[PDB]
């Protein structure tokens, strides 16, 4: 499995002249104002991944952020609500064309309440995501090989997931519903950053 | 004064709604659109008058009301439009899509309270007292009582004024584009409820 | 104004119950029939009068009342008959079979509220103010107070009129055979409580 | 060695169901019948074989199956019939009258345990291991899917016989019968909008 | 109005407690006897008068009061004696063991309610209105305000009458020996609390 | 060897129980004594052997066993006696006076844990693995399985040894008189359960 | 009502009314979340029966006179539930006071016979006073505050001096003075912990 | 495997603790210092060795240990020092001033997990599998077992290394002054526990 490890940013975008990119982040935790962005992982869906180490206090990542704001490229996330929040918070740029496999799962896998990426991978691809490195020091100067491998595998499968979910969304006639959710998702992430992370803004109470 | 025009089935015409924003509210037999039918639709232009339209059981159309709801040039103002949008779309087959919700607006601006009910908002923003005593009554009755007609009309009489104040607040706190994205999703949030996700926050992690 | 006939043990005859439906309520020392004995049985024909029957500790029979409760040609009207059927069957060894329950009926028609208590229903459907101050008193006292006699009577004075309204609403919402099935099972539901399943919804998944 | 006959849409005929009681189960896209369509109906006569019927999306009719469902001289056996009766009636418009439910039966007899799932029941009563390990709307079911679907009806006759012995011994037969008589209306109540409500509760 | 004798440290003598049963109550700085000291001990013979005894910080003895509490021929009547026995035993080192508790008696007889507070019991059994406004105040104050002494006294004024009524109920429902056994264990239930088991129902399965 | 004697109805005689203390356990159809009958009674003298007695449906007497249960010179050792005393007394009409409970003893001595089940206690104190697999089986079967017989016996085989250890800990931690008072109340706690207070901590404030 | 209240824009004109040992402090905001809900008003009483009400503007970053007061080691800052006020004051102006007294902590250390420790409840019991919490829900960011708003904000500091005195009496009586002192010393860091991201976390709990 | 010195009562001297920081752990009869006595104190200098000190019931003095505990030139390292400080100060009357707590450190640095127990911390930071089997054993036994001794020594063996790693993370994330202030308050937090506030977050709004 080719994993390309970088300091700061992609060297260029030669591997990303594509319709859709898989994106994932690693952080020091779930609170963007407290827990910094540590890693950004990318994949074109060709079985290879780029793992990008983000330094403490890093202000720019010009090639990556160009990708994130290219409206002709769909950004695929699993639970992008999280990734979009810490990415926009770090680099000041909120993507607006996105696909989320966790939203897709909740719209199609109506026979389960387990929508984690591990469960989705095991069910739709018979691929075993190992969640051991999830709780590790992602801010470490040098990432372990197990850290690099775990971070890369969280992006390696998202294109295949996207294709299967797109089939299910069409079969159950929920395409326009999913699209509206994906359209709002950047604003749902913004709401989190502005102080509404604990509030379902559409709830009655 | 307290002018309330009560109608059977539909508005007779749209003469009173050559305007850019109409206040809308409904009454039903309950909170479950597949079980509890639409019984009343209330409208107001904001001129202190109100229109109250009784909806018959099994009624599938209301062409004048539905033209108003369909008009992309007319904003439909609701309090908690998530509810009204769902029952209206389920009954008449059309989902409005230019909307404004005073409850979402309140949750985006009245950040100092967990009380965002229409009664609370009217009390604090306008010093108008709203009585919820008829909220739980037989809205399906063939003839509505006078207390019933007045309660229903007062739920739309004040929404124009609330919208103006919330728009000031959304501007002052720089939350206009946030509020607009929420209103853009609201019709689909209501479709999610009809489709079977009414108990699910679709954006939650678990 | 309201005539209340008080009896010890049993009605003297059934001269006042040559009718097709009788309102029935009970008073007890509490909610657990194996521990809390039946203290009072109240009956009404629907004519604005009531009979209040004091049941002695250890009383095993009441022939006239039990004949009433066994008469399949006479519907027994309860509010939440699930409770009354259990204590009645436990005390006298007879489970009434032809019943109407205003609380089930409320849950089947008053779909716009979650308050299905008798006091709530009387206020909304009849504009009649039950007072619940005497519900918590010593119903086993040798002499019932004037307040107790009044309260016990008022819990059967309106069940006929409630039934007529709920029956109209069940017809309107096309829920008659649903209601009839629930009333059919209700004696068995009360038997289930006596047998040991009072805490279990027998139909729940878990 | 378990014979499983797979069908598209309906049984071809009723030659294997000239019987007093049939085991019935379903697979769906989820627990909410207004959203999650019927995908599979499974039947067994109790002879160790099963019929697995694939229900197409949008399918309105299944004449042989539905004839069975509405034949009052044939008892429909379920595990938690409340669910299956709801999706069957919602899909084909016919609510069965004459039913037997092993989950209700378990709750009336297995008073020594708090676990009334079919897997728990089979393990204890029959020493049989049910495995509950998917997309039931797939065009082609997998071998594992076909076998899981059949295994949920192969045991209900034997479970029913044992539960009848326990209902008789504990003198709860007429209690069970009344619960079975109400069960179709309980499923109907679910479809009308009372799925979250114990209709007999005080509050 | 109410004759209340206020003392510092102890009763001046025992001349008013040559009786069969005494009503006892306490005031503290809180519910945790290792942190919250005893501040007041109230007594009454049931004659309409009460003694209110101020306890000093660090006071280790109260000879006349503790004589009463140790007297086996004198029943001590508490409402929720579990609390009073704990703090009385902690402060003075003597644990009464001839006791009667109106809360336990209420839970054994007033099976038609779940409200067993003293104010609730006083209202129902005696039509007497205990006011609880002074419950949360500085009972450690050097000088108790008239409001406090009146509140302190009212908590012992009625325990004799309540005991009589509950003893009739315990006889009627044939629970006398049940009540006796619970009263017998109550000093040890208080000890269990002081020893570290106050959050544990020692008899619960889990 | 583990010799288990199986009996129908009662012990043949008391020749194996001329002892100071007897281990007792029961099996039933469930946790509700008014619904779930006594099925098995198990006894052990602590000599490594056990008697397993099958109780028939509707059995009213067991003269030798019940002689043991009311012999005040023999302590009856249970694990969670609150349960066994209730079903035994409910079945045969005789409530023991003199008991020891290993679960209460565990709650008073094993203050470092919240797991007080028999299996847990046997594992820690004796390094004896009790299997709980047969705990939920049909105990009313005409013929018990060998696994059932061996499971039933093993619930009484270790209670004497547990008693010895808990008594050592009660002594070391100076809690003997606390335990004794708990054991003295335990029959009345079980009696309160049968009378209708099974869900009530009678000593709780609320 | 109508006690003397001096309403200011932005800051105090000077500190002439604050050559004292302890100052009563309170704030009004748009909510409980300092990173979202801006500081709107600061209220001060010297204990002399008068009060100063300071309008804070959106985006305002300095209040030199006020901040001098908050930074003064010789002047104790008295709050009710200072955990909140310290966080929003530190967040808006960049300065965290560290000589503080809190009547809610003190209430939790002395009023051990109750579980109601809000300012309303303390004032009713200790002083026989009503602090009409009805204006708690109003627009504290309005251009012009109402007379009703000015008097509610002012009354939330008129009583803190008398409350401190009664509580110091209680801490002395129950021998908890050094316990209260330790709690007050940590309080500014408890406020910092909230701003930094631990507002939902009892940092000392086992879990 | 590792050198463990077992002592009765106290260290013989401080020859092994002429150091800047000492790792400290205790074993007890439970979580409640007023009820559950100190049984064992464990120490380590960080050199791979440990001292295991058996504390007798009623023991009032441990002069060498307590000299260590009050030496302000020696940092005392705990995991969840809130517990150990409370029981140590309660037992010997001396509260350490200068402490470091790995669980507070963890809550301030391991912000990517919600599991802060010592086992989880060792697993992640050191790849060290702490066995927690001996947690539920009789720590007050006269003679500890080798498994007990070895489990007791295991905790303190890693605290110096954990401290070093946690200090690196506190420096990296710029939280050292935050941590110092928490460690400075920690002895008063343990004091609050002994004084009666163990269930109370003293800094919370409610
Ligand atoms: Cl049928
Ligand atoms: Cl005995
Ligand atoms: Na992700
Ligand atoms: Na990741
Ligand atoms: Na309305
Ligand atoms: Na609405
Ligand atoms: Na009734
Ligand atoms: Na009644
Ligand atoms: Na199935
Ligand atoms: Na047919
Ligand atoms: Na089933
Ligand atoms: Na008391
Ligand atoms: Na009192
Ligand atoms: Na057993
Ligand atoms: Na037992
Ligand atoms: Na404040
Ligand atoms: Na304030
Ligand atoms: Na330890
Ligand atoms: Na520790």
């Amino acid at each position: 499995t080719e994993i390309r490890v970088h300091q700061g940013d992609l060297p260029n975008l030669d591997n990303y002249r594509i319709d859709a990119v898989a994106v994932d982040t690693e952080t020091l935790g779930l609170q963007p104002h407290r827990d910094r962005l540590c890693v950004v992982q990318l994949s074109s869906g060709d079985g290879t991944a780029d793992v990008i180490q983000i330094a403490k206090g890093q202000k720019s990542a010009p090639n990556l952020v160009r990708l994130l704001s290219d409206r002709d490229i769909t950004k695929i996330f699993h639970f992008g609500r999280f990734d979009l929040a810490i990415l926009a918070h770090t680099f000041g740029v909120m993507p607006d064309v996105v696909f989320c496999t966790k939203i897709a799962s909740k719209l199609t896998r109506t026979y389960t309440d387990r929508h984690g990426l591990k469960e989705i991978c095991g069910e739709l691809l018979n691929v075993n995501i190992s969640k051991q490195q999830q709780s590790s020091d992602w801010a470490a100067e040098t990432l372990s090989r197990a850290q690099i491998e775990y971070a890369a595998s969280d992006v390696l499968y998202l294109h295949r997931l996207k294709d299967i979910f797109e089939e299910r969304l069409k079969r159950e006639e929920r395409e326009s519903v999913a699209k509206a959710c994906f359209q709002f998702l950047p604003m749902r992430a913004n709401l989190d950053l502005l102080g509404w992370s604990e509030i379902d803004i559409f709830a009655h109470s």
Side-chain angles (χ1 to χ4, degrees), chain A:
Chain A
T1 296
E2 194 198 348
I3 306 168
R4 306 175 281 270
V5 180
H6 315 279
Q7 297 316 301
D9 192 19
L10 292 174
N12 52 53
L13 295 177
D14 298 348
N15 287 320
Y16 289 94
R17 312 301 185 190
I18 58 184
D19 280 358
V21 53
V23 188
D24 194 31
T25 62
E26 307 297 343
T27 68
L28 283 174
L30 312 170
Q31 306 174 21
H33 296 279
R34 185 192 61 194
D35 303 320
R36 75 171 186 91
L37 182 64
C38 290
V39 189
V40 180
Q41 307 103 253
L42 303 164
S43 182
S44 62
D46 69 345
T48 75
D50 294 274
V51 172
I52 309 169
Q53 278 184 270
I54 310 302
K56 185 174 172 257
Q58 180 181 324
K59 281 325 235 172
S60 53
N63 290 315
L64 164 72
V65 161
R66 187 162 198 171
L67 248 188
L68 294 183
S69 41
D70 188 337
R71 88 183 43 95
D72 292 331
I73 304 186
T74 303
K75 271 68 62 168
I76 315 164
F77 310 87
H78 175 82
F79 201 59
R81 183 184 174 167
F82 178 78
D83 299 295
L84 299 163
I86 186 63
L87 287 166
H89 179 73
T90 307
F91 302 121
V93 168
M94 175 63 79
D96 35 44
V97 185
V98 306
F99 185 99
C100 176
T101 61
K102 185 156 214 185
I103 291 179
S105 177
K106 293 161 79 63
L107 290 174
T108 56
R109 285 164 79 249
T110 43
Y111 45 84
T112 179
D113 76 345
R114 292 154 90 84
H115 306 282
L117 176 72
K118 192 180 142 62
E119 283 268 321
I120 289 166
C121 284
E123 180 184 290
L124 299 195
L125 311 175
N126 185 29
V127 162
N128 189 343
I129 302 296
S130 173
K131 269 180 112 201
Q132 196 175 331
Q133 304 299 302
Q134 192 188 41
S135 300
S136 63
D137 182 17
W138 286 109
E141 205 201 274
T142 289
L143 297 170
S144 73
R145 181 76 197 169
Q147 276 179 304
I148 285 139
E149 267 162 10
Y150 166 92
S153 69
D154 264 6
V155 283
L156 282 184
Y157 303 102
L158 298 189
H159 284 90
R160 281 151 79 185
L161 292 184
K162 174 158 176 293
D163 293 344
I164 293 160
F165 281 127
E166 265 164 358
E167 267 151 45
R168 305 262 183 110
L169 287 168
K170 175 197 266 240
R171 194 188 54 192
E172 263 52 81
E173 309 184 81
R174 296 175 194 152
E175 296 176 309
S176 71
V177 168
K179 192 225 264 218
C181 297
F182 301 147
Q183 198 139 349
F184 183 71
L185 188 57
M187 192 60 57
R188 176 66 269 188
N190 260 116
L191 276 161
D192 290 348
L193 288 170
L194 300 171
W196 276 272
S197 72
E198 306 296 313
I199 299 292
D200 177 0
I201 198 72
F202 304 109
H204 182 269
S205 21

